[PDB]
Write a protein that binds this ligand. Sequence first.
Ligand SMILES: Nc1ncnc2c1ncn2[C@@H]1O[C@H](COP(=O)(O)OP(=O)(O)OP(=O)(O)O)[C@@H](O)[C@H]1O
Ligand SMILES: Nc1ncnc2c1ncn2[C@@H]1O[C@H](COP(=O)(O)OP(=O)(O)OP(=O)(O)O)[C@@H](O)[C@H]1O
Ligand SMILES: [Mg+2]
Lengths: 257, 252
Amino acid sequence: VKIPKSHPRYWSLYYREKIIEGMEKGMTAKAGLIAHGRGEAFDYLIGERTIEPAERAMRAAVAKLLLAENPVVSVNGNVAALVPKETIELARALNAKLEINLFYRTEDRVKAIAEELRKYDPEIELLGINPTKRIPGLEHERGKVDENGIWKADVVVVPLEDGDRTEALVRMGKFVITIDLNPLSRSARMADITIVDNIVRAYPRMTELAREMKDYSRGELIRIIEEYDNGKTLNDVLLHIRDRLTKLAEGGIWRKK
Amino acid sequence: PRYWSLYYREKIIEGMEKGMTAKAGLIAHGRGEAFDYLIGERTIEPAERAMRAAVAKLLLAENPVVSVNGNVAALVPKETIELARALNAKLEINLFYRTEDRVKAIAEELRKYDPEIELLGINPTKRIPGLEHERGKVDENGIWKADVVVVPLEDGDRTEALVRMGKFVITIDLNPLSRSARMADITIVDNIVRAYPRMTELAREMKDYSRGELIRIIEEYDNGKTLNDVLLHIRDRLTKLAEGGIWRKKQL
Ligand SMILES: Nc1ncnc2c1ncn2[C@@H]1O[C@H](COP(=O)(O)OP(=O)(O)OP(=O)(O)O)[C@@H](O)[C@H]1O
Ligand SMILES: Nc1ncnc2c1ncn2[C@@H]1O[C@H](COP(=O)(O)OP(=O)(O)OP(=O)(O)O)[C@@H](O)[C@H]1O
Ligand SMILES: [Mg+2]
């Protein structure tokens, strides 16, 4: 660990290392490294915390997940590098299935992800090891899915997802929840609930939420879901980024700080 | 067809396959994209403005050098050579994660589009003080003796250092708030894949201008105001996106 606990970018920097390792364990694609950067820049803009518009989406997503009939949490190379333990914990609290789901699928990459998750829960049912069914639209099996998971699923969480896949799953009729720091991504705009938070914070938080909201009665959960407006929430995120820009600038930019 | 975004993602990845571009550089590419999303993935007027002023400055320079790192080599090898010849400037390979293998990789990739181009920074012998040895190497006939350097996609410490050395520094950076963007004398907030073709085309035309008209452009240019204008662009844009809403819309 090449930097000090006092460092103002400590956590950011720590996760950069985690996604690098991820790659050289065979988990995270190169393309994923670019996506990690995309996330970094936007986190910095958002303020590297869980903003209210994100808290709001997460209350609603967890309620929707808890009322679901066959909820699946997806995993890919980035998630496996960054929050292997927390994704298991979240799937456990939801009693949701975990399905590995990649755009750059490989038996090798699939196996690296599996082994990494097993490190944390050797017992865990993993789906998408050998996926038979496929999503209408998409492409050369860059849209392959397991038949006992996302194929079957009414409600999916698809973190850090590609826009083609999010939009396609919606057209199937899946209720899609995404976690994505970029509110302007196609995936963010096409999801049913879009949580604009870093997944390193979103998952542990959704886990806390699920642990409290388990005790909520159905009607309570349905009130939350029915109140929720994903359009206003995205709009609130853009204006939040807008206002942090004018705050970061103030006192002038050029030379320097 | 988000074609070009994807096209350049492949280029940066091939960049690392070729040994030209480091892992950090892939993250950095992603950061760039994030800001390109905010700006609207085009060349806005304040970047057009900075690029004019930059090209003027470069055409009046005595010892102009355009610098190349792993990311620039992956994205615009062809165009970086064109820009240099059009400016009559030297080309220096200059990068943070310096490796003989990566330098060679970059050299060959540049030699593809111009086998007879002279490449500085193959074995630089001078250093910028106040950095590290491997962050800080500069070539005796290039950056060391330059009055004007173009350093795209640059670490803020190197930029600031070069300014400490009395170099007039021009940068291309999609992040208007970066250390490097704050420290440069002229900051072009644009995608390099856009900025370089554009500057090449500006150089060909502004060669026709009087020295006097170039000096005027140089002296009117205000990098502080220009960066504020890039933020105002961004803010008004987000304000307009929000008012209209974005959820479930195909194109923004
Ligand atoms: N640590 C993180 N926490 C949360 N989200 C992140 C993190 N790292 C990256 N992301 C987001 O995950 C997404 C990955 O999806 P992808 O790479 O397909 O984006 P895209 O191709 O630009 O958008 P689209 O495919 O929707 O047009 C990115 O939008 C990125 O911002
Ligand atoms: N295609 C591109 N066009 C223009 N600017 C880009 C492009 N890709 C990346 N950039 C910008 O180049 C800079 C990349 O440099 P980087 O952030 O890696 O250096 P650094 O600031 O020294 O490192 P760190 O930010 O981790 O301290 C970022 O500001 C990024 O926005
Ligand atoms: Mg930076």
